[PDB]
Ligand binder design. Structure first.
Ligand SMILES: NCCC[C@H](N)C(=O)O
Ligand SMILES: NCCC[C@H](N)C(=O)O
Ligand SMILES: NCCC[C@H](N)C(=O)O
Ligand SMILES: [Mn+2]
Ligand SMILES: [Mn+2]
Ligand SMILES: [Mn+2]
Ligand SMILES: [Mn+2]
Ligand SMILES: [Mn+2]
Ligand SMILES: [Mn+2]
Lengths: 314, 314, 314
């Protein structure tokens, strides 16, 4: 199945800039070229051009609502189209608010999809529970059916239609959840494996349970939304909201290796790589290389190694 | 149940100074204020003032015996009193010799208590087996009933009465045990999970077994004596005796989260944070923040998040 | 059973120099003296003197073939002799090409031996599959019976006779395997636990399975060939080919503790410690100390502690 890379250089979902440079940094490291060495056919859609909405005043506490809503409507259209042609979409972020468009467009073609969200955060604050008003911490709230009508309609998002139920998403890596968010995930009965569960079970058991929960009853497309801050700051330091005690480099690759093995990956997001936030050049290189490795892992690259079929190396 | 913070700025149990500054460093980081945000009622007893015993000559190889014995007698009295009023005592060290007074005072009110000792060391050397004579490496020897009469009475400790049996203590994190200490824990049949057992079982299984061993037969108060060097030097570098290959930050919090969940925590010690031993200011900040996080974890703070009851955040 | 330390200061198996200084660095850290504190009788054979073969032109792509082949023939002779006298050989590298001589000499006395290869690499490239021509990445190819006749006879190695079968070796730590190597290990059905398997199973289960696979049917001598780059660069940075996401310090010691417990260790290699590759003096000290700890672990040193028999420490 073909792969289509879609750059989403957008940072309006955040208070500070820099994450819009993520796609460029990833390409600079040769992500596209490296992906072409895998078993998949790769196509680069390029980077989307986003139109900044003039006089985009705050909707209550929410910041840049129209700009964020517009960027996501455009991304959703692009993703829906690539999905329609039967190709796996790979969105390079960009802040996590872009998951609204990515998942929305994906669901237009595969409404029965499930979501595996790797992040130190739930990103499920609503316009009413958010303390910052930053849309990068509210993606999931705009996507969940059970949250529909629980907050006022935000300018620029009227095109959004809640596509997934609280039962179709699984969080992995949680360790920085706001009171309101914790109330929401507990009240909605959302399935999650915070770092506490990862420590208890081991990443091996976490993936077994994640798959039995989401796929045990029926096999459906998987949308993996990977926020780089899900891994410990020691591995991915160049990111907006680093939180200590995260997933290790090994655990991140294990997650992606297992997702690859399911043969169900249909959509992927590689978010929050902010090249301007490295304390040193090396911290940026470290973060970019990790994001690249995770992406290649999603598409076949295994740590035990790989070799071409019908080729007698000896 | 109320919480009472007791500072024990004492370093005579060690050859070098600096650890007496631990309580100050912990408070500076806002430990007290942060604890007040938990579900517990918090009271700060302040820092105990210790009277240095004049001409405190060495008892054989043992150093500062009278000063250490006197400081611990005072701490035991203070702890016994807070325990008597039904409050959970939290001792901020200070070197680990202060566990003598902390546990002794605790046992005066809850004689059926059990001890979970998180440390890279057993701290079970007796005045006869010690190679250094430092009392910070001998706490447990003064507390165990089975060791009573196995060493000469040390000046300043005649007030001490062995309160716990070798069967009421569980070590977690061991990786730097002297020959004599190893002989003692094996000969006394003390239950332990050295790093070898943690690697084999995983911290999840270690806590299950620790609880079944200490609480399976009967539920009793838990005294958690946490030496910061139990965690790997990468997490808590500013400490007197760092040892490579320790518990991770995640594992330390898992331990404390599980202890919180038992609902049996009755006494706590946060020891060996020495602010003068950081190779850089950041290593000190790293160590203090970790100690603070572990303390908050013992009192309810969970990585999956927390929220106030009877509060509709939506 | 006696122990005999054999230094192999050789670096011709690699493109760059420096690893020949490994034995010196290890001794400088007091490896020999520390080993004498264990339960084993220790003898130091000293460092072998290798004769550089003049005009050692490349055999096709292979570099320094005659020099590498000659050094290994000499090492094999020395190892065979120590093995003959019933002593455990401990080879200090030196680049991993020296495993050819170490294992070859070992097999002359214990032809039924098995090999546990801890490395981030398989080092199984043949003179035809190698992209570099460096012999440090081809040791196993010269040792495997199934690879006999799969590549042209290399000058300087005519003395070598494939001694082990693909079924007598187990890899642990793999995470950087070339396409050709992956083709070879899959085609030959070699047993391995790449980092993916370690993440899935946990090091505890990995060792159980390694032993059931190699020893379940019959107990035989164990040859442990330990490449320091098997551990993550955070623990052993001063090495030629560091690869992120490796075994932890704890896991490395667990491996060695378990091998010690089998009572079957017959030959040991401590390879790839290159003192010239530390980014700082401390990174070198860190690498050397780790190699020393692993070696002592192989001979009895346990993290739970150790004490002398027939000695009443109390
Ligand atoms: N991704 C960071 C999220 C932080 C906080 N939950 C917020 O909603 O602002
Ligand atoms: N806490 C460090 C202890 C070191 C050694 N066991 C001693 O008793 O001096
Ligand atoms: N030990 C490093 C090996 C790297 C590569 N497999 C090679 O054969 O050159
Ligand atoms: Mn996040
Ligand atoms: Mn996120
Ligand atoms: Mn200690
Ligand atoms: Mn201690
Ligand atoms: Mn290697
Ligand atoms: Mn090697």
């Amino acid at each position: 199945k073909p792969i289509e890379i879609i750059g989403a250089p957008f940072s309006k979902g955040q208070p500070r800039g820099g994450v819009e440079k993520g796609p460029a940094a990833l390409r600079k490291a040769g992500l596209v070229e490296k992906l072409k060495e895998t078993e998949y056919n790769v196509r680069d859609h390029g980077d989307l051009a986003f139109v900044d909405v003039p006089n985009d005043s705050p909707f209550q506490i929410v910041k840049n609502p129209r700009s964020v809503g517009k960027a996501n409507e455009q991304l959703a259209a692009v993703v829906a189209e690539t999905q329609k042609n039967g190709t796996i979409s790979v969105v390079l972020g960009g802040d996590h608010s872009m998951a609204i468009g990515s998942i929305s467009g994906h669901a237009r073609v595969h409404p029965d999809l499930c979501v595996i969200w790797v992040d130190a955060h739930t990103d499920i604050n609503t316009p009413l529970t958010t303390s910052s008003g930053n849309l990068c911490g509210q993606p999931v709230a705009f996507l969940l059916k059970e949250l529909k009508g629980k907050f006022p309609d935000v300018p620029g998002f009227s095109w959004v239609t809640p596509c997934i139920s609280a039962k179709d998403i699984v969080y992995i890596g949680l360790r920085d959840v706001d009171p309101g968010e914790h109330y929401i995930i507990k009240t909605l009965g959302i399935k999650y494996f915070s770092m506490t569960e990862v420590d208890k079970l081991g990443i091996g058991k976490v993936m077994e349970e994640t798959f039995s929960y989401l796929l045990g009853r029926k096999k459906r497309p998987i949308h993996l939304s990977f926020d780089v801050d899900g891994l410990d700051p020691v591995f991915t330091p160049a990111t907006g909201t680093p939180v200590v005690g995260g997933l290790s480099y090994r655990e991140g690759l294990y997650i992606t290796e297992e997702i690859y093995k399911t043969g169900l990956l249909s959509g992927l997001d590689i978010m929050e790589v902010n090249p301007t936030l490295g304390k040193t050049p090396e911290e940026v290189t470290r973060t970019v290389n990790t994001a690249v490795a995770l992406t290649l892992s999603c598409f076949g690259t295994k740590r035990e190694g790989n070799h071409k079929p019908e080729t007698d190396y000896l």
